[PDB]
Amino acid sequence: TEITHHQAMINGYRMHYVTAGSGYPLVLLHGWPQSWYEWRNVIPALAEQFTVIAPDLRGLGDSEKPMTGFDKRTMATDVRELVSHLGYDKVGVIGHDWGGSVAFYFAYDNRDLVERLFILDMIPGLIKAGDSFPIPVALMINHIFFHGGNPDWATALISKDVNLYLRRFLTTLDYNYSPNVFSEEDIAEYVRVNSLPGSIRSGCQWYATGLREDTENLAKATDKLTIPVIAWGGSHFLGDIRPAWQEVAENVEGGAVENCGHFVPEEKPQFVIDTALKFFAPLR
Amino acid sequence: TEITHHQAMINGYRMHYVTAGSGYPLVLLHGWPQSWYEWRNVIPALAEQFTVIAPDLRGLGDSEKPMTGFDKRTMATDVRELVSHLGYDKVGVIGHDWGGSVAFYFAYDNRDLVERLFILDMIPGLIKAGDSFPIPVALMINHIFFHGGNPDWATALISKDVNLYLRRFLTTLDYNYSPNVFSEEDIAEYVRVNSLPGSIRSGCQWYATGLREDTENLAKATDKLTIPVIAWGGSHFLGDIRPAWQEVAENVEGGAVENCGHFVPEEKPQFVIDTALKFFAPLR
Amino acid sequence: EITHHQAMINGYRMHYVTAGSGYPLVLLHGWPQSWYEWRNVIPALAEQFTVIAPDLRGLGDSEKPMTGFDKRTMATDVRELVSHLGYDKVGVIGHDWGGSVAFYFAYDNRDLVERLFILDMIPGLIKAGDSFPIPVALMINHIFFHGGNPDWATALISKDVNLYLRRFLTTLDYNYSPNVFSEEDIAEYVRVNSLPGSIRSGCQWYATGLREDTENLAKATDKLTIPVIAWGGSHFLGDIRPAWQEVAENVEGGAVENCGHFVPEEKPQFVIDTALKFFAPLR
Amino acid sequence: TEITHHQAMINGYRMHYVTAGSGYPLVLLHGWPQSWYEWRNVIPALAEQFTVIAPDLRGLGDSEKPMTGFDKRTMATDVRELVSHLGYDKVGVIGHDWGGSVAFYFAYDNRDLVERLFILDMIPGLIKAGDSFPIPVALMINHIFFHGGNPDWATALISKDVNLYLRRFLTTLDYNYSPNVFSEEDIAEYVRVNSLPGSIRSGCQWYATGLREDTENLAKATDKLTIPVIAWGGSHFLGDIRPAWQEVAENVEGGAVENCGHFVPEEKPQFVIDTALKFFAPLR
Amino acid sequence: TEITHHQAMINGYRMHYVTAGSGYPLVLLHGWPQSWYEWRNVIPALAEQFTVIAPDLRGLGDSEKPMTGFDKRTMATDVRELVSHLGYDKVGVIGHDWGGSVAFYFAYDNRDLVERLFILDMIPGLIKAGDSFPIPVALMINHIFFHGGNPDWATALISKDVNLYLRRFLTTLDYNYSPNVFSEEDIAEYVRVNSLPGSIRSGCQWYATGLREDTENLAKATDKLTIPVIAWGGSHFLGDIRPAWQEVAENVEGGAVENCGHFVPEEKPQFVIDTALKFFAPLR
Amino acid sequence: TEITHHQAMINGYRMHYVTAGSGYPLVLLHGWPQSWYEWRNVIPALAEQFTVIAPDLRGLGDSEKPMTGFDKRTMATDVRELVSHLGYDKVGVIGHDWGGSVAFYFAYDNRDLVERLFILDMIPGLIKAGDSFPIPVALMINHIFFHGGNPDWATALISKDVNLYLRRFLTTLDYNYSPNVFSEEDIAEYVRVNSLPGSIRSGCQWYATGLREDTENLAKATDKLTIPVIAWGGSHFLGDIRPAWQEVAENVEGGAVENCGHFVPEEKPQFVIDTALKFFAPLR
Amino acid sequence: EITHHQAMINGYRMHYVTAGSGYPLVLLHGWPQSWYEWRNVIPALAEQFTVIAPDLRGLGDSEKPMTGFDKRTMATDVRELVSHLGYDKVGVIGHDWGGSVAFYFAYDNRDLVERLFILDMIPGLIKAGDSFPIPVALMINHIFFHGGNPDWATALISKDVNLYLRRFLTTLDYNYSPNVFSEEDIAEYVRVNSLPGSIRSGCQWYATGLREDTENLAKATDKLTIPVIAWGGSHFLGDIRPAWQEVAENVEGGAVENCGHFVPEEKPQFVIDTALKFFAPLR
């Protein structure tokens, strides 16, 4: 059940991923501003019953950092190339934050490949082409407009002080139940990977495609998933995300985790462990 | 026919203002990230026929900078208090950018005081309580979410490098027809005033009240102005702003200034001079 | 008199300046510059020619896409500009990477560009398959810095743009004289290269320069037939005729005496004089 | 097994070196941007059967930092003076990175001193005078042109943030199989020594000379070594470096270390340990 | 009428001072955070009629910067040694800010030497031992507690950004009627001299001694001056400072300069010029 | 043998000191750039047989930082007042670096108070008034001229980066046999106390008096000590300092500590313990 | 009027200016300066002479090797430059370290330098085997800071060159007046000293100044026979006649009233008047 670091050449760049365990494969997809590291307290328990695969998605963590392909459908093709490279034609998938949107396209574009889908604190995308943002949603997630608005200006302002900027998400009360989810060591690891030249540039592209090409993909994604889907959000961030996933999927269970913010794998790792072992058991 | 620097005790703080010329009074109201200085190529023409009053609005320029009262209703009471201070009971008003919204409330709350109103590249408020931002508009003005979402965090990232940030607005092709509206000496003036401790914090309170109390105040402003209004946007920013002003005013004319960006008083001063002289001539 | 203009080109806002009237001349700048490098040549050309000097993709005050920095794609931008302005015939002047873009602008639009003037540049850095002599790799060691790992180069340059640009603008290995540029001038280049995206975009010029550009130049085997002149500084590339002779049938030029890489600024009068005579038959 | 810290006066500067164990002496020679410290996980195992000697080469680690003599032949005289000072007339050598080039001149210039030579992820020199860098090779090792090209300018760009710069090498997927070969403590040790004034200057001179004097010395070094050589590269950096070493040595063995980058001593210490003990066994 | 720069060794340090003109000597004593430069628009007009002598006081401007002797009694002895050096046994004095407090000790301690005293916008000392600060006074001059409370801590915080801090006094509406009394080239001159190592340390010792030995001295300074004293404050700072001076002088005239802040010599030079020429007229 | 932290009001400032143990009192005097903390590995053993007293001398460590009194005669009067406040009329003293010079004046000025004197790697002063510096000596201690020449300018250049500057002394092969005498935690403690405002200013004053007042004091200090003295230097710094102490003391023993630099207490704490326990035994 | 030039000199590009015509005079600057310190002197001398004012090894805009910073070797650079311009006979003015370079230039080329004008310098800092009295070591404490551990001094200086240079440029112990330099003149010296290698190189001037140069000055026993004038500022080195009499047989000079160290900049008319008289026999 020990984690090994690996790389492979995926769609012209070096993708870092970790593996643990044996048996049926579960792919864990992190979000912004994180890395496979955000699953470190989940992987060992899952690795007793599953093969666990946790990549650093295009641009983030220790993965190399292309200049394009940050729309979530293109990033989903990296996950596909990775899974097929490891020799698997069937997988379960957990996706948190942007990883849940990548997870959505990964399942939507590969109905032969994804058998079960577990989302944590994410909606299938930010918005569909032609829809509007209610003022309170805009305020609750203002950062999408700063990151994705003029991404080179965001990158400059963030890269000046990554240690300060990441704490807007990692320690504040509007993102977490407890301001103490993350040790200073854990925050230092996220500051290390977001400080690698290109990580901030890549991350603002995640948001910038998120308000452009991704919105056009979401409006055209009307063919509901037929696989089992569970969607759990944190009481103290997106709350009950089950209805949102009900819109792109026939079979959706879930709700909100009590006294839990956005970073569900790190604030309530035992919730994710237990929920996942039960949700994926029929696949072992 | 030459500008003079003045100050006055206004609603508990020291407010900076420049006066010039004589005859019927015009009150010129700057926006963000500027000061009375944006009117410097306008004032000397208006001053041949008019008394010209151009203050530093609350928190910005060389004005003092309280900790609240940044909704445009409250700042308009500042303009009321000053005009009362200077002996005037009837005035003309030009408002650019947020000056525009301050001017809207100044006219709305004092029906006997503001006789005519000239707006540049602004709408009466960003949005009304209950409404939503189309993606295109959210992207065009993404800064409003950065400044207004978590003001303290935005103040921190902007304050690290005012010289860099201000240029997002002052020299870019999405804000200006020409990237050369501002000499380095002009930019250095607006960096000086915005580098005064409290100027950035106050500036972000402008956007923060912008998306909270200001939106409530606009949903309740349905008693339309009866006074003549003109409203000129720049071709290369807000364009034909007449319809936005017809929602809150019975008697609106104007349109788009051609090959002109957001900073109409500095990119096309002659346009502002000729319009103003003709629009306010009836009040001499 | 120079007028500032913008146009929506290939999905971004392109800044360009115009002056004068009559036959159109396009002046294409290089790294780390902008239209501003032609500021002391334009008024003299403006007397006899329409002059159009754009900020190429990502540099100067132009908008800064994330892709399309290979020189063929930056040539399509110039085609779109020239078409936007109403012209179906142009003269072109290209300095540094502006020369390489010029080259592709001519190569891909045989019935649009009538005459080509290259300053201190070769068609591209190298063809795919070829290798760098050690002395050459040491002379232009910066291409590997900017183009090798562009994010890393972007990080290291951006901490001090005022310092890094002086590697090129005041040194004796790029200039006959270390006083070609006023402090006001360096400050303009610092200003545009400190706009978020300008450095990132610049490193993309070099990255594509060592990758896709090398493939496009290896296949660029159909020689230009239009008149070409190629002049390099004595104290940089010097006599660049042999290099252009490989992509062009009709090549004149050579080396400017006591002149470094930045010929438009070090020797404004040479460029004015050479261009009025070269472009004369097009009025 | 205890590592001890020493210094000797060597060719006019103070050289830091560490020692461990007892028996026949093995000299371990580090490369850029490291120090004796890259051997820390190999020394104790070697020290059970050998005397282990690991200096900080001229200008790097904690050694003093002259302004000249950074060509690899001069630096090998330093290693000769150290071995002589310690009283030994026969040694084995392991050289990693630039320490492999210094090892090469140490063996070439002292044919009765050095009995066996183990090379890790290096070639005898970057290139021979009169030869050309293929475009893929120039891109792979593009840092040599940056350091060596205009050393004062590289020195300034690097010294501005040593902690950022060294991670280009220490945590990247193109230099390492895993992005996790180095703890934050290990990188801080390399940042410490390379933050000592003179270290970045000295390191740039290793490369400057690497592309000048060293290229001419390599072309003239036409006498193949007669002593046993093993040369092992990482699968994910130089790979099978036997042919490169077959040009300068008559008896060469080795290959590629599986799923190993450039930093073989730290990424596969057990591989270096097992290989050294078997290769140097006949000298005990 | 031309300013010349000089230096003289005074009480064991190099004192900088400027001279112009001929006739009866007037000595001009600057305050904080300034230098002889604050008198630059007064000196030429005073020099048509008088010898003008304007030194950099101890530690400030380009004068050298001892570690002790910042009490105003001691700094008055430097001015005595300077008037001695230049060979005058009768002078008039103008003293602004702390220069006024020095000028007081200069007259008090040398009664045959100082014939007439002109104070600008100062009181003889911040306070007498035994007395207490009203809350209004404490808030109005809070900087005195900063500088003089823990001078090393004030020194470190101010010195981090001298350009930012000086503007607390030079451009603000509580120090100045107009926020434009100083150009950028003028604020640059004050940032230049206060960035000379030792200028901020010296400055804080002006304040530290101002709240300690100066208070003991002022309590025991009870034999009032017999010489004619005029004291003028700015209407927007100290105002009518006659009562404060009537305490320590028998023959006081003066009052308040209309629409003038603290810096009377740069904001209302002509007032200083006409008040001076009239007040010292009986000395030619 | 637990160390306890204390303070006393000594000659007008708050002096930090630690104590430990019981019986006859030994006073340990640190040098530059250090504090009581250099004694931390010696105190516990000496505390089994003695009362151990280790002060932070004027301006350094956590002691307060007056602006004067940094000549070593004056700093020795602080130690007299401390020993007198603690109620002792007989003491032994150990002094290292500048502590040794302070110890010298303490014994020289208090012939009946100090019974025995242990010097570590110091000479009684830098130089006697009227003597000259050979070129090699000036180069070996070049920093005294940096610190003491123009202390404000050195304070400015050192205070920009204290972490970097202290390493000139703490990790360098010319000050230390080993570059690893100090952990990062130890260096951090020295950086912490020398990053207190006043500390660097005070340190520079030690050197400034060191080349001024102290040279006049030392020329006049011709009445040799009569009490037992032992003086031990590092093999790799001052070596056998007996002859230097025999010029000011009749009864001197000591020599050089093998493979030891300047920081004897931290590089060879056991030598200091063993030597102090034998030397001070007769006083128990 | 002043022309910026360069030449390959002993393996590096040396920047130099020239002006005027007739007999050549060579002007050698000191630390922390450049050809620039002569700019109020050059105009008046260019009415009667050719003026040549190089940037010495590693300072100003000249290129910056790692070695050869001893004043005998820096004098070989000056000999190579003079001979590139084809003069068999020169007059020389040296200020500060330029004075010591001038000394070895004169000492090592007995038929090249006809006449020598020293401003506020001594032949070297000190002779090997000699010692610094305490007040001397304090007055020039900077030589030990720059020359002791050069790498350490470079790090501390280079963190803020604008602050450090003011130790020399605006202080009452280096200058009668604190206003000898405009902000624009200080910015010029900050610019050249902010080029990477400038501070490293300057520190090597002092490092060699307290080592090889002390050995070389001890072995410089053959007094010069050519006319030497030596003038210090009243408020720095004062009457430097005696110091130059130890190494030259024919020395005149003294002290300039109310003048610090930077005589070329605080008393240009004094340097002009003195140069024109002294070198007049050489027209």
Distance from CA of D7 to the nearest CA of F (A): 7
Whose tokens are 């790029």? That residue is: C174
A177 is catalytic: no
Q: Are C162 and C188 in contact (CB under 8 A)?
A: no
Q: Which residues of A189-206 are buried (b: 16+ CB within 10 A; e: fewer)?
A: bbbbbbbbbbbbbbbbbb
Tokens found for residue F281: 């035994």
Query: Quick check: E272 and E244 in contact, CB under 8 A?
Result: no
Out of E16, E96, E236, E262, the active site residue is: E262
* Residues of chain D with C-beta less than 8 angstroms from the C-beta of A188: 184
**Looking at CA atoms only, how far is residue D216 from chain G in angstroms?**
18
Q: Which residue in the block uniquely carries the two structure tokens 């530690």?
A: E59
B184-194 vs B199-210: helix axis angle to the nearest 10? 80
Encoded tokens for E210: 């101002």
Cα A216 from Cα B135, distance rounded (Å): 11
DSSP state, residue G121:
-
Inter-chain CB proximity E178 and B6 less than 8 Å = yes
Contacts of F259 in chain D (CB under 8 A): 6
Q: Cβ of D156 and C163 within 8 Å?
A: yes
Q: Say how many Å lie between the first and final Cα of chain F, rounded.
A: 17
C145 CB neighbours in chain D (<8 A) are 142, 145-146, 149
| Interchain CB contacts (distance < 8 Å): C and G | 30
Give the C-alpha separation, F114 to F94, whole Å.
11
Which subunits sit against B, judged by 3+ Cβ pairs under 8 A? A, C, E
Q: Give me the amino acid identity at G54.
A: P
> How many residue contacts between C and D have a Cβ separation below 8 Å?
78
Q: Three-class SS of residue D139?
A: helix
- In this complex, which of C66, C152, C196 lies closest to A156 when CB atoms are compared? C196
Tokens of G2: 């002043």
Cα–Cα distance, A187 to G230 (Å, whole number) = 66
Of D62, D186, D199, which to mutate for an interface test with F (greatest number of F Cβ within 10 Å)? D62
Show the beta-strand stretches assigned E in chain B.
4-10, 13-21, 25-29, 51-55, 91-96, 114-120, 132-134, 229-234, 252-257
CB-nearest to E179 from B62, B188, B195 is B62
Catalytic residue among B97, B121, B165, B236: B97
Q: Which residues of A82-93 are buried (b: 16+ CB within 10 A; e: fewer)?
A: bbeeeeeeebbb
d(CA A96, CA A118): 9
Query: Residues with Cβ < 8 Å from A271, sequence gap 6 or more?
Result: A232, A257, A260, A264
Which one of D168, D173, D184, D259 would you mutate to disrupt binding with A, by most A Cβ within 10 Å of its Cβ? D173
D152, G196 Cβ separation under 8 angstroms: yes
Residues making up chain E, counted from first to last: 284
Chains A and D lie in contact, requiring 3 or more CB pairs less than 8 Å apart: yes
Tokens of E78: 């430097």
Cβ of C137 within 8 Å of Cβ of D165? The answer is no
Cα of G172 to nearest chain C Cα, Å:
29
Map residue D255 onto helix, strand or coil.
Answer: strand
Nearest Cα to B36, choosing from E179, E268, E182, E236? E179
Contacts of D197 in chain G (CB under 8 A): 149, 151-152, 154-155
Direct distance between the N- and C-terminal alpha carbons of chain E, in angstroms, rounded to an integer? 17
B173/C5 touch (CB, cutoff 8 Å), yes or no:
no
* Tokens coding D188: 């801080």
Instruction: Say which of A67, A159, A197 has its CB closest to residue C66.
Output: A67
Distances (CA, A) of D29 to D95, D97, F204, G98: 5, 9, 41, 44
**Contact list, D67 vs chain G (CB under 8 Å):** 66-67, 150, 204
What does the block give as tokens for A28? 């864990």
The Cα C51–Cα C17 span in angstroms is: 8
From D137, D148, D153, residue closest to C167, measured CB to CB: D153
| Distance of alpha carbon B200 from alpha carbon B193, whole angstroms | 9
Look up tokens 């050579």; give the residue: C254
Q: Are C120 and C261 in contact (CB under 8 A)?
A: yes
Q: Which chain A residues touch D171 with a CB distance below 8 Å?
A: 62, 192, 196
Method used for this model? Answer: X-ray
Q: Strand D252-257 to strand C251-256: parallel, antiparallel, or no bridges (unpaired)?
A: unpaired
| A125's tokens | 């995308």
> How far is residue A36's CA from residue E39's CA, in Å, rounded to a whole number?
66
* Residue tagged active-site, from G107, G206, G213, G235: G206
E16 is catalytic: no
Contact partners for chain F, using 3 or more CB pairs closer than 8 A, are D, E, G
Structure tokens at F185: 């935690």
**Partner residue facing F160 (CB), from G144, G152, G160:** G160
Residue of F nearest to D17 (CA): F178
Q: How far is C155 from chain B (nearest CA, A)?
A: 16
Interface test mutation site (partner A, options C200, C206, C211, max chain A beta carbons within 10 A):
C200
Taking the CA of residue D165 and the nearest CA in chain C, the distance in Å comes to 8
On whether the CB atoms of residues F72 and F217 are closer than 8 A, the answer is yes
Contact criterion met (CB below 8 Å) for A71 and A11 = no
| Cβ–Cβ under 8 Å, residues G2 and G19 | yes
In the residue annotation, G61 being an active-site residue is answered as no
Beta carbons of D144 and D126 less than 8 angstroms apart: yes
Chain B residue numbers with beta carbons less than 8 Å from the beta carbon of C2 are none
Q: Which residues of B touch C7 (CB under 8 A)?
A: none
Closest CA of chain C from G276, distance in Å = 29
d(CA B238, CA B121): 6
Determine contact, residues A261/A236, Cβ cutoff 8 Å: yes
Sign for the CA dihedral angle at E194, E198, E201, E202 comes to: negative
Separation CA E70–CA E88 (nearest Å): 24
Based on the number of CB atoms within 10 Å of its own CB, is F9 exposed (0-12), middle (13-18) or buried (19 or more)?
A: exposed
Check CB contact under 8 Å for G178 and E62. yes
HSE-CB of A216 using CA atoms within 13 angstroms: 6
> Number of C-alpha atoms within 13 angstroms, CB side, residue D43?
22
Q: 3-state class of G117 per DSSP?
A: strand
Cα(B92)–Cα(B280) distance, integer angstroms: 7
Type and span of the H or E element at A116 = strand A114-120
SS3 of D154, please? helix
Subunits with 3+ Cβ pairs within 8 Å of C are A, B, D, G
Contact F134 G131 (CB under 8 A): yes
Cβ–Cβ of F65/E198 closer than 8 Å?
no
Question: Do the Cβ atoms of A275 and A232 come closer than 8 Å?
Answer: yes
Q: Which of D97, D108, D165, D175 is catalytic?
A: D97
